[PDB]
Design a protein around this ligand. Structure first.
Ligand SMILES: Cc1cn([C@H]2C[C@H](O)[C@@H](COP(=O)(O)OP(=O)(O)OP(=O)(O)O)O2)c(=O)[nH]c1=O
Ligand SMILES: Cc1cn([C@H]2C[C@H](O)[C@@H](COP(=O)(O)OP(=O)(O)OP(=O)(O)O)O2)c(=O)[nH]c1=O
Ligand SMILES: Cc1cn([C@H]2C[C@H](O)[C@@H](COP(=O)(O)OP(=O)(O)OP(=O)(O)O)O2)c(=O)[nH]c1=O
Ligand SMILES: Cc1cn([C@H]2C[C@H](O)[C@@H](COP(=O)(O)OP(=O)(O)OP(=O)(O)O)O2)c(=O)[nH]c1=O
Ligand SMILES: [Mg+2]
Ligand SMILES: [Mg+2]
Ligand SMILES: [Mg+2]
Ligand SMILES: [Mg+2]
Lengths: 456, 253, 275, 272, 267
């Protein structure tokens, strides 16, 4: 913090690292050493510019703290001053990894490292584009974490193209594979790696067996078409149902909840926030027995044989209703063993919607549960509304725009409300990550007397 | 950025020290002289009247004959099956999975790894051009990509800026608008230059305008705009085969 | 500052003998009712899509460069530097350099390529541009730091590409202010919009003044408006018509004169066609 | 604060004792209908694009600055002060000085330029110009003492400034300019343009202009007292005048006809 | 703060224990039954179609024959012009548009005889040009006891929310003080067809600024005339909304009578 620590004023000594696996020669070649100041031994690494002048110190203690000695630049790499060219470099994530690579390669290859890590890799890799021109191949060696995959994915835009390969590791990074005796598998990852292939560039050579797989399901959907196109629902998917106000989102998701608890036999955990708990159960009882219940006054008091219709469909422990919310859903997943989690309204729950969607995506990634989330649309500025038969685009998502970047499939419904008939819906798939194909799925009618969306 | 006149002593000599011909009808090379670096070729036709066949045949005749890497951004396995069925002269749209000649058909097409596909935007095309090293890039159905007038003009501006100072041949497929009087496009109406739907910036940034017309199976190829030479009109006639899929050049009067 | 009526005795006297028009080439009917081009002049050039704006402006630039000794600056955004350099070298030697592979192969193997290059650019008048707000700064550096007198901008729709109307109005205002109090001829190339009914502009339709696309602020800040026309589907595909649509200095509009394009030499010559 | 109507006899007595007058020129029906320009009013002159909206106003300025002795200020923003003070030399001597090099060389040779200069700019009747504009106009009114101020080409004081919303800026500029003209009581002649039509012929080919064709806002016709519109076809010299709105009197419509002399540059009255 | 309906007999008895008629055509008094205390009245026309002339005639008829206290607010112009216009309009002589008569009555000595006929009482009060306008109107309502307050121009008060807040504040003022209030506004620029100056029927949509100008006011009176037509002086009066009566549509017709200056009715 104060000034650049001289070894004379701090009792500098070059030693080895027994508990980490680095000898004294590698730290002597790099510049990593240990000072004795303030009683507690402080480890310290040295940074040098292109010329070779001492420009920065990195001070760490036995309890993993950070102490920058002054103005830390963005073009300072740990291991940059010693090499000024070559044909193959190895980019690591930390500083002990670069020492491990120098130990396992007998100080031969030009090996550099980052000074920020997976948090600020873009800032230290965008401004260092002029240094990477004198190289021929780059081997990225990141962590086997989520942040390492995020860093190697977001580092695809600031690096030169056609030269950089990515290697994989079974450990966290190179150091535990050095400790567990995997010194024969790291050299094959340095010498051989894989190309980028970022998300859309599929070469024709890599279709040797994918066409044969094409020339060879999951949870099905009720009512016509949908399951023929998106191949049903899978574990970990986040299904979105977007329509206009009054288009029948709750009836559709309630019919999907009924046919997944009486035929598939899976535990379904409901969460209705638009209404009370004494109404959705009556709606399920009316939906199962083919007779509409909540819209007839005489039949509500005629049957009160009510217990027979109750234990015919609620006789098991299948359904779980509900009257901060993430702990409730985590109890519904773990403590009850539910397979389907339905969230009816999200706007009553900018920065709030994004954080909520990241938290739900992390929950669905950790647990692996079928998750249905219902939201609403925007308000169109020119033309007809979504209730007279205007097709829903993927842009019109109510709230912060990021409802489509963290989802997996989107199903929309359209019907002419003030028209010639209101009982002929159109189902539109807007996005499917697995299958890919979009568009019109089928046509269903409502059948006003019963309440089942039978196909037509 | 300001470059004087005496700084081009050897850059012009390097620029003098490139043509990519068109297969099928040989009359097209008689007036537009093929293509070159920074060439936008807008190909249009009616509503499914020989719309995605000619560009696919030109891609196949550029891929396996001249060794040019052809990147198709078709809007993955379907176009590969279509290319395999097209090169072996069969009507794909069962037997080849049994006797094992599917690997024999696969090893003769993609064994020289020229072709590249797109998985179902401009940064990916820049990575396909600079990183992989292709020369011909084909885009289809630009109406799916794109107020429907400000977006298409900025899209054509960005594609023309990408084709400049890169040396790439960019083939773009678009649509036509619906007629109002007389006869329709499906009956053989002669197309005009102002039938390109969407905006009027499509013919102000393109370097070649090619149009295809047909009714029973005789097609007509018409050059509407050429910035290199300036010759327009009918370039020839081709005939489509209902048994192989290969439309062949004819000599109709 | 607010000036008075007595301090204008010397400055008007100096301005009265400072001003000299630059003549046009290719046609003599244009100079009879436009009287050339002076300092603080904006000349808008328009036609249909692919009718010959770039050829006419390149010919005007060549005749203003190699004959009168005027220092000419180009801002070709439609193409790059080497292409337009080859166009100028081929056009001055009365050939078509791009459309002949045999001529390009021949002139490099006999040593005369340095004969054509050193006779044009040896007098270092031409200054090209290698491709908002920095464009005006680079044009100001081209004017003040180099001393040019004619500045050409091609295909202005690249520069305006939120809302296009306010952007093109502010751009036209900035270019008019750059031409004002500097003393430089500014040639600007623009295009037309789509017609509504009838035949198109590429088949020989007479153009009005309200067809300049983008806004209506293009004809309100321009000093001279020239429109070129031809028919590519008629009998004569190389017979153009030049129409002066607006002249704020003289006030004469209408048809200037017909010309004829040569398919072999690249030049276009004054014809003698009668209506 | 408020003003009672009883203690107002002296102000009404001294107000109608004086102003009125300041006639136009070129035509007769303009002074028949509009009865001239008055102090405090804002007179808006419209034409097409290059149809003679700057020759007419400079001809009116030459009539008002010479034959009546009124001090006239000109905020010309199209061209510089070297050209708009050069045309007034030639128009007074019934020639076209800027459009002929021979007459320029002759008046350089014989020394007649000083005789043409001292016969017009002898009296301080012409003050030229080359939030930084309205302060200069207030200085012209207060410190210099001008009587007729000509604001030219208002389309480059609302488009040369960076504003996210253009129409509110035009409305604020228009109401501030009207408040200035009402407070100081100076005659103000403002020049604007027209917008693009939707169908039919163009304004440069003989379109009958309406009042809603004002380009930029909808308060240009709501805060002006007299709207003069010029129409001609390109006989390519028969220009007619339409008075579109007058707040003072009631009669609006076709005023008359004028013709442009191609050898001198005047707007002579015609008959048709 | 709530009030039950049973303990309200005394306030209903003292409340109900026609209104100010208009001038010009007799249909505007037959259709909307005149003006009432607490209303907000809007008068709409095109640019220069006779907004200030009609309301100035209304102020003259309400300030002389009825004798009620009338407060004008000419934000558009000065006070000498509207004073001379009222003096000329009461004497049936077009005063401001005549040069040979303004210098005639100042030397004859009968100028004060015309002055004290309508300004003899303390009836008329004038305004001399953001939030100070409401304080001045409250001063005109309290310290003078005005009955009809006329506001000549609402658009120059605006330097969308600034119009809604202003209209709610003016409605609250006119409801709390119980004063009759007339506010003049303009029409918007149309998109297709003829203009409002050549005889286009004005719809209720055409109001500049915002769309709550037709939601808070109690009546809207539009005036239309054909400027470039066979006659330029036959106007049409259209009632667009009336909460009290309900009947809307074309009320009647008035001619201008160019020499005198009175909107006298026609057939
Ligand atoms: C889809 C559909 C619904 N209906 C009925 C079913 C319901 O009783 C009613 C409304 O459908 P609901 O599903 O109840 O509407 P919603 O609560 O999901 O909407 P939101 O949450 O956005 O406010 O209409 C039909 O009659 N015909 C139909 O085709
Ligand atoms: C002048 C002229 C050119 N040509 C040919 C020769 C030219 O190489 C070719 C194109 O000339 P260009 O001038 O380059 O065409 P353009 O600038 O109008 O097109 P764009 O709008 O896309 O910028 O046209 C004719 O056929 N007839 C003619 O009269
Ligand atoms: C009035 C008139 C002008 N002219 C010519 C002579 C003038 O020098 C020329 C234009 O002179 P200007 O008066 O400067 O034209 P303008 O002010 O209308 O231009 P802009 O709208 O772009 O500001 O028009 C005619 O030919 N016939 C005419 O009737
Ligand atoms: C009512 C009317 C007025 N006029 C003329 C004569 C009046 O002196 C002149 C006064 O116009 P104004 O009444 O002042 O016009 P305005 O108030 O509607 O518009 P703005 O204040 O926004 O400019 O209108 C007619 O010619 N015919 C008519 O029918
Ligand atoms: Mg619901
Ligand atoms: Mg061009
Ligand atoms: Mg002008
Ligand atoms: Mg008024």
């Amino acid at each position: 913090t104060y000034n650049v620590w001289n070894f004379g004023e701090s009792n500098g000594r070059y030693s080895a690292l027994t508990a980490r696996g680095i000898s004294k020669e590698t730290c002597q070649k790099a510049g990593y050493w240990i000072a004795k100041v303030d009683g507690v031994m402080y480890q310290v690494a040295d940074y040098r510019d292109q010329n070779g002048n001492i420009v920065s110190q990195k001070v760490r203690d036995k309890d993993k703290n950070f102490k920058t000695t002054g103005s830390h630049k963005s073009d300072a790499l740990f291991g940059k001053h010693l090499w000024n060219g070559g044909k193959k470099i190895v980019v690591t994530e930390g500083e002990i990894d670069m020492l491990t690579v120098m130990e396992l390669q007998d100080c031969k290859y030009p090996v550099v490292s980052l000074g920020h890590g997976a948090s600020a890799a873009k800032k230290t890799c965008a401004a260092n584009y002029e240094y990477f021109d004198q190289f021929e191949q780059i081997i990225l060696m990141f962590d086997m974490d989520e942040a390492g995959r995020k860093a190697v994915e977001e580092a695809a835009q600031v690096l030169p193209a056609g030269k950089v390969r990515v290697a994989v590791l079974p450990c966290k990074d190179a150091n535990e594979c050095h400790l567990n005796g995997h010194d024969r598998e790291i050299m094959e990852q340095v010498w051989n790696a894989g190309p980028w292939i970022p998300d859309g560039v599929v070469s024709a050579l890599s279709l040797r067996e994918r066409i044969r797989e094409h020339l060879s399901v999951g949870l099905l959907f009720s009512g016509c078409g949908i399951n023929d196109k998106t191949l049903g629902a899978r574990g970990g998917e986040v299904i979105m149902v977007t329509s206009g106000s009054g288009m029948g989102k709750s009836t559709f998701v309630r019919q999907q909840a009924l046919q997944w608890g009486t035929a598939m036999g899976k535990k379904v955990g409901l969460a209705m926030l638009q209404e009370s708990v004494e109404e959705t159960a009556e709606d399920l009882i009316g939906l199962h027995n083919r007779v509409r219940l909540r819209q007839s006054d005489s039949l509500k008091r005629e049957i009160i044989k009510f217990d027979q219709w109750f234990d015919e469909l609620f006789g098991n422990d299948t359904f779980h209703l509900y009257d901060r919310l993430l702990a409730k859903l985590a109890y519904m997943r773990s403590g009850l063993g539910c397979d389907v989690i339905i969230l009816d309204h999200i706007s009553i729950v900018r920065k709030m919607i994004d954080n909520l969607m990241t938290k739900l995506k992390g929950f669905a990634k950790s647990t692996g549960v079928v998750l249905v989330v219902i939201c609403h649309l925007k308000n169109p500025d020119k033309g007809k509304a979504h209730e007279e038969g205007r097709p829903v685009s993927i842009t019109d998502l109510r709230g912060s725009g990021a409802l489509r970047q963290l989802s997996d499939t989107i199903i929309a419904l359209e019907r002419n409300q003030q028209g010639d008939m209101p009982n002929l819906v159109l189902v539109r798939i807007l996005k499917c990550r697995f299958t890919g194909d979009t568009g019109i799925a089928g046509y269903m009618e409502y059948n006003k007397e019963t309440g089942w969306l039978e196909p037509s």
